[PDB]
């Protein structure tokens, strides 16, 4: 539950090549969303006609809000009330929870923004933007600080408005919970001006009554409408019996939220919800469980694969992160640090070096392949890859598997039985063959997961060449030419390959109509 959770974006102040694609992305990400886990960054919307109704249901942002180069006449956050600022946006010193630059909007309307829990508010170079100076940010900003002129003539605030307004009308008056209080409750927010009308110290922003059950938001943990110092533990210690009992009323901690189950992008581990799993712990069914014996070698993923980090994947059985294989992976590239300082140049590497991923069985993030090289033809380096968890996804189309503009001729990764919680995008691979005929729902876990297979090599041109599925695979498809490459087999399945009858291949007993097995028969 949690109504509707979103993942924010990290890619900040970065300019997109296509503006239509970029709008389509933000619309897909934020529609029906109520709670954005991460940063909500609204960048490069130049068209005034664009519909920003995806912001309509957003109520809370855990990270920061960045609004840059938005030219739409009216930017409106109808339901947003809380910006937590757990992560903050700052340039290469000051750190912001709300930051608006180079935007040509006439009005920015957040009529129900009550509290900014961490970081500052900042406005810069917004020539048509107005009313922001009538706001009095000391009320909204948690610390209690005054935070950061237009060209146009600006309409006076509606008569109803006591002090300030976000825009035109009486529904755009700024509400006050902190400054209109009796001194009798220093360090809190009131629902009225009288001395008894103060609110619980746990409240954030506003509040309806005096109890912790009455807050708009919680300065600490939010458990299903109630604010509390701590989340009810999954295991609670018993002082009398000296035993750590299992708690029937237990809940998992997810950020500043208390939840019964945990979001698909996180694993539950010891009463909390973590993205990664401990060194002495095994991922199993979305829970960090103890591994039987030695723990399977889990090494971290990388933002871009290169010569500097390829060795670090030696003997890895699980990759916790993503793999991006780009033209740069084979070409080698000039790295950079956030300092803006020049980084190391990675010695070009050839595709044969990718045999490192041979031991890899699982990738917890997404697998992305956009690299081109004459020798980089199949993707058999991941022939032991079993599942791609979509715990993190690409920014566009929520892709868990994205093969775009690669120099591939076949996939060749059998054993890949499951892409859980993602979409598959395979487009514009001039010579990629089998992708067109694989029915990807068979691999995918939920029918709601989408697939996009476009612009590859014609299925007919693949036929003419003969690079099709073996006459032993069912209608599901295959990863490549081979007999061991079928997704599923319409006849008998033996070892990794598929035969017509267990009569062929000498000794093999048929303990199933769909499978045969090897002997030392009946």
């Amino acid at each position: 539950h949690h109504h509707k959770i979103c993942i924010g974006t990290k890619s900040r102040l970065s300019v997109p090549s296509n503006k239509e694609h970029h709008y389509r992305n933000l619309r897909d990400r934020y529609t029906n969303c109520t709670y954005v886990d991460g940063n909500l960054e609204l960048t490069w919307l130049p068209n005034e006609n664009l519909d920003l109704s995806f912001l309509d249901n957003i109520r809370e942002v855990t990270g920061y809000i960045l609004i840059s180069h938005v030219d739409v006449k009216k930017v409106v956050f109808p339901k947003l009330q809380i910006i937590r600022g757990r992560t903050l946006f700052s340039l290469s010193e000051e750190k912001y929870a709300l930051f608006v630059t180079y935007s040509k909007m006439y009005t920015l309307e957040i009529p129900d923004l009550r509290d900014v829990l961490n970081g500052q508010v900042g406005f810069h170079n917004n020539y048509n933007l107005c009313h922001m100076r009538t706001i009095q940010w000391s009320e909204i900003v948690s610390n209690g600080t005054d935070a950061y002129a237009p060209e146009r003539e600006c309409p006076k605030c509606h008569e109803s408005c006591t002090h300030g307004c976000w825009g035109e009308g009486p529904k755009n008056c700024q509400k006050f919970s902190k400054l209109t209080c009796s001194p009798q409750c220093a360090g809190g927010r009131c629902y009225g001006p009288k001395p008894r009308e103060c609110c619980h110290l746990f409240c954030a922003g506003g509040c309806t009554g005096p109890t912790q059950k009455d807050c708009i938001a919680c300065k600490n943990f939010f458990d299903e409408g109630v604010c509390k110092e701590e989340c009810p533990p999954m295991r609670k210690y018993n002082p009398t019996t000296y035993v750590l009992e299992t708690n029937p009323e237990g809940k998992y901690a997810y950020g500043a939220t208390c939840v019964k189950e945990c979001p698909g992008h996180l694993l539950r581990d010891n009463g909390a919800c973590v993205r990664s799993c401990p060194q002495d712990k095994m991922d199993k069914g979305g829970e960090c469980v103890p591994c039987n014996g030695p723990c399977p070698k889990t090494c971290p993923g990388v933002t871009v694969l290169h010569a500097g980090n390829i060795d670090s994947f030696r003997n890895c059985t699980v990759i916790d992160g993503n793999i991006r294989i780009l033209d740069q992976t084979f070409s080698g590239f000039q790295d950079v640090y956030a300092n803006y300082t020049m980084g190391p140049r990675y010695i070009p590497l050839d595709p044969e070096r990718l045999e490192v991923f041979s031991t890899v069985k699982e990738i917890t993030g997404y697998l992305n392949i956009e690299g081109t090289h004459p020798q980089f033809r199949n993707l058999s380096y991941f022939r032991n890859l079993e599942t791609i968890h979509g715990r993190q996804l690409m920014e566009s189309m929520f892709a868990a598997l994205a093969i775009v503009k690669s120099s591939l001729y076949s996939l060749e990764m059998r054993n890949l039985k499951q892409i859980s919680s993602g979409s598959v995008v395979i487009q514009h691979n001039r010579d990629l063959c089998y992708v067109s005929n694989i029915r990807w729902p068979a691999i995918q876990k939920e029918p709601e997961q989408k697939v996009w297979v476009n612009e590859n090599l014609r299925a007919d041109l693949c036929e003419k060449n003969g690079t099709i599925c073996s006459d032993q695979c069912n209608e599901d498809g295959c990863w490549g030419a081979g007999t061991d490459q079928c997704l599923n087999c319409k006849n008998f399945n033996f070892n990794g390959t598929c035969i017509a009858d267990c009569g062929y291949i000498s000794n093999a007993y048929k303990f199933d109509n769909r499978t045969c097995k090897i002997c030392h028969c009946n």
């Binding site: 300019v15 090549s17 239509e20 780009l326 566009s396 189309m397 503009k405 995008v425």
Partner: protein
């Protein structure tokens, strides 16, 4: 939105795939962005861009 050029030392290496480097200072603080060539996106335009306009299968 008036933008000026980034240092020629910086221009040569930073932006990738024939991308245009452009710099904007905000309150005397030089922020370097990177205008991409068609079909490329990223902070330095290092990743190829995906077309999201096709219908799903």
């Amino acid at each position: 939105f008036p933008t000026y050029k980034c240092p020629e030392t910086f221009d040569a290496w930073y932006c990738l795939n024939d991308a245009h480097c452009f710099a904007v200072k905000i309150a005397d603080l030089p922020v370097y962005s990177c205008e991409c060539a068609i079909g490329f996106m990223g902070q330095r335009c290092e990743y190829k861009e995906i077309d999201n306009t096709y219908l799903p299968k």
